Structure 1
Amino acid sequence: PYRYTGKLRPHYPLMPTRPVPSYIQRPDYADHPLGMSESEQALKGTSQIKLLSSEDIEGMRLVCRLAREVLDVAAGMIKPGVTTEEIDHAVHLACIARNCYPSPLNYYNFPKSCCTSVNEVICHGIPDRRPLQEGDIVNVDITLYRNGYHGDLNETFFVGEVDDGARKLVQTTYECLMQAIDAVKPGVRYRELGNIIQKHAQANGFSVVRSYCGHGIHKLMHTAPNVPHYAKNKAVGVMKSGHVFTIEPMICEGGWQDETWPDGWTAVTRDGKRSAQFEHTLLVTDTGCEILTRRLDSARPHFMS
């Protein structure tokens, strides 16, 4: 019998799977019975990092801007009483309204159109019938697919008033991300970002999840490079102009250890304490990076409003 690590439980049944009208272009895994991607299988095992063409950069700018618009739709719905399923429904419609496919939907049979990660959920939480509670923290992770390209971002949000521990965890996590982004430029080793993130997390009494990493993204949802967020990692590769990847630190109040729910997706702290995450998709430029998933109409993430 599965022993839950914290207070959270899945709230079933799920509403029937939401359809995407056929005029929306679909990634290859959308119609695979196990949600496997033939294009991913063909590239599996590569450590070759794509140098994006100008056409690819235009494709990544567009899908990442639309992904930010969809996260912003989700951010507007965060309040006590709203279920994660209701947020996912709004996200699904917002994706379709922008002629995008919701990348998570049927990815290895993932059942929903975004990931909603409350409290002790590290990542990949499945939207369900649980209403958000005053005091919760919730990550919404949006991945969209447009014209052959995926874009990926996430923010952690407060549900009503939260305690000082929630404030410190979310603020430190956001700082970890911005300190890592600020280091991105040609010639920096991908393994260096984890030293920066862990140094800031540890300084604030938090741990860094080891089982999940930032990743290459463009024609595949994940590919080279692998970008760990913890110190002294063995990530292979050196940043060059035209590289596109995510940085998405998952930081925990307690220990770093994770386990998975019987659903096969929900990653939780083994100790049941809270975890927060922020994510941007980055394009390395000749001298810095472009934050493809940046908020355009505000300097700050939603939790600071």
Structure 2
Amino acid sequence: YRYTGKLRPHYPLMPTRPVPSYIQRPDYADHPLGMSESEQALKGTSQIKLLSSEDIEGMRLVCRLAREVLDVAAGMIKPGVTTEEIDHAVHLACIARNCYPSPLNYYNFPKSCCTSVNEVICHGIPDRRPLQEGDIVNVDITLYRNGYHGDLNETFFVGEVDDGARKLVQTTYECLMQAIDAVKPGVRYRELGNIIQKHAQANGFSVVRSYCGHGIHKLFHTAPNVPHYAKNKAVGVMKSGHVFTIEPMICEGGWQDETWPDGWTAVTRDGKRSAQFEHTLLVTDTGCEILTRRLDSARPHFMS
């Protein structure tokens, strides 16, 4: 394997972390390959669930707890902290909230959250690498509570970063928020990618094609697919009661990704940096409710 930049995995990984049996588990938690039979039963349907009153409450709850966990991880981002240490804090914070960390054993994903540094696009595996001054690091949190998943992420700065990092991160965050601003009943899912690419391109950046936002609720990933690039052929039209993520990954260089020999870590083929933000949204009559927003602060963590 020829690495595409300077990042390397730092092994060994700590043994899988157990989750106490009192915490309610998703179906894939105990499947030996991490397969979700409730997602597989739905494999090739385009049908989007219309959430009940009760579903919305379950989503509001899990997404708020998820935000709380992401904020814990935010507090830990500094030079010399390892991504495994961040993941341990996350795993304990989920447990404190009587939540299962949804990534844990999801298709045999080995950790409780994803930590993506610099050229990693997404799905990096927490490991022994200490964060370095100048890094940009994304923490991607997903929680499972009472049958519902809530999924969000942010990119953070590790100490002082260069100007390119500041611009990449800022534009990525703008991309997500312009897409969120367009959400409202009657809009097609395929439109969001147009908005995203239009803004990333205006700032000299590209859009990852190989990973999409997605419906989420009782399933971790389900219809609609939500591509982030222009002229995609995504199916479906937003209606009040739809819940899904938007989670654009934007890159300094070209859009092409490849995966590490670990089968998870996705990286730019050119080794240039990539940044991401994600929220879980519910479509309402006036537009949308950002279920994973901050409640107590105006801005994402990187702005402060």
Q: TM-score, normalised to structure 2's length?
A: 1.00
**CA-to-partner distance for each residue in 1:279-304, whole Å, 9 max, x for gaps?**
00000002210000000110100000
In the alignment, the residues of structure 2 paired with residue 45 and residue 23 of structure 1 have an alpha-carbon distance, to the nearest angstrom, of: 33
**CA-to-partner distance for each residue in 1:95-144, whole Å, 9 max, x for gaps?**
00000000000001100000000000000000000000000000000000
Partner residue of 2:201? 202
In the alignment, the residues of structure 2 paired with residue 221 and residue 169 of structure 1 have an alpha-carbon distance, to the nearest angstrom, of: 28
**CA-to-partner distance for each residue in 1:24-74, whole Å, 9 max, x for gaps?**
000000000001011111111110000000000000000000000000000
In the alignment, the residues of structure 1 paired with residue 194 and residue 10 of structure 2 have an alpha-carbon distance, to the nearest angstrom, of: 38
Identity %: 100
Partner residue of 1:87? 86
Q: Report SS of the residue matched to 1:191.
A: helix
Partner residue of 1:150? 149
- The count of residues paired between Structure 1 and Structure 2 equals 304
**CA-to-partner distance for each residue in 1:172-227, whole Å, 9 max, x for gaps?**
00000010000000000001000000000000000000000110000111000001
Q: Report SS of the residue matched to 1:77.
A: coil
In the alignment, the residues of structure 2 paired with residue 7 and residue 89 of structure 1 have an alpha-carbon distance, to the nearest angstrom, of: 25
Once superposed, which parts of structure 1, at least 4 consecutive aligned residues long, lie more than 6 Å away?
none
**CA-to-partner distance for each residue in 1:138-175, whole Å, 9 max, x for gaps?**
00000000000000000000000000000000000000
Q: Are 2:274 and 1:275 equivalent residues in the alignment?
A: yes
In the alignment, the residues of structure 2 paired with residue 187 and residue 37 of structure 1 have an alpha-carbon distance, to the nearest angstrom, of: 31
Partner residue of 1:245? 244
Offset, 1:18: 0.6
Equivalence map 1:87-166=2 (5 Å)? 87-166=86-165
In the alignment, the residues of structure 1 paired with residue 158 and residue 186 of structure 2 have an alpha-carbon distance, to the nearest angstrom, of: 40
Q: Extract unaligned runs of 5+ from structure 1.
A: none
Q: Report SS of the residue matched to 2:189.
A: coil
Q: Extract unaligned runs of 5+ from structure 2.
A: none
**CA-to-partner distance for each residue in 1:246-299, whole Å, 9 max, x for gaps?**
000000000000000010100000000000000000000022100000001101
**CA-to-partner distance for each residue in 1:7-29, whole Å, 9 max, x for gaps?**
00000000111100000000000
Q: Report SS of the residue matched to 1:169.
A: helix
In the alignment, the residues of structure 2 paired with residue 279 and residue 295 of structure 1 have an alpha-carbon distance, to the nearest angstrom, of: 13
**CA-to-partner distance for each residue in 1:220-250, whole Å, 9 max, x for gaps?**
1100000111111100000000000000000
The root-mean-square deviation of aligned C-alpha atoms, in Å, is 0.4
Q: Report SS of the residue matched to 1:15.
A: coil
Partner residue of 2:33? 34
In the alignment, the residues of structure 2 paired with residue 110 and residue 214 of structure 1 have an alpha-carbon distance, to the nearest angstrom, of: 18
In the alignment, the residues of structure 2 paired with residue 128 and residue 204 of structure 1 have an alpha-carbon distance, to the nearest angstrom, of: 32
In the alignment, the residues of structure 1 paired with residue 292 and residue 142 of structure 2 have an alpha-carbon distance, to the nearest angstrom, of: 11
In the alignment, the residues of structure 2 paired with residue 181 and residue 141 of structure 1 have an alpha-carbon distance, to the nearest angstrom, of: 18
In the alignment, the residues of structure 1 paired with residue 298 and residue 180 of structure 2 have an alpha-carbon distance, to the nearest angstrom, of: 15
In the alignment, the residues of structure 2 paired with residue 8 and residue 194 of structure 1 have an alpha-carbon distance, to the nearest angstrom, of: 29
In the alignment, the residues of structure 1 paired with residue 62 and residue 208 of structure 2 have an alpha-carbon distance, to the nearest angstrom, of: 27
In the alignment, the residues of structure 2 paired with residue 215 and residue 231 of structure 1 have an alpha-carbon distance, to the nearest angstrom, of: 16
In the alignment, the residues of structure 1 paired with residue 18 and residue 113 of structure 2 have an alpha-carbon distance, to the nearest angstrom, of: 14
In the alignment, the residues of structure 1 paired with residue 80 and residue 8 of structure 2 have an alpha-carbon distance, to the nearest angstrom, of: 16
Q: TM-score, normalised to structure 1's length?
A: 0.99
In the alignment, the residues of structure 2 paired with residue 39 and residue 189 of structure 1 have an alpha-carbon distance, to the nearest angstrom, of: 26
In the alignment, the residues of structure 1 paired with residue 33 and residue 229 of structure 2 have an alpha-carbon distance, to the nearest angstrom, of: 32
In the alignment, the residues of structure 2 paired with residue 12 and residue 123 of structure 1 have an alpha-carbon distance, to the nearest angstrom, of: 19
Partner residue of 2:9? 10
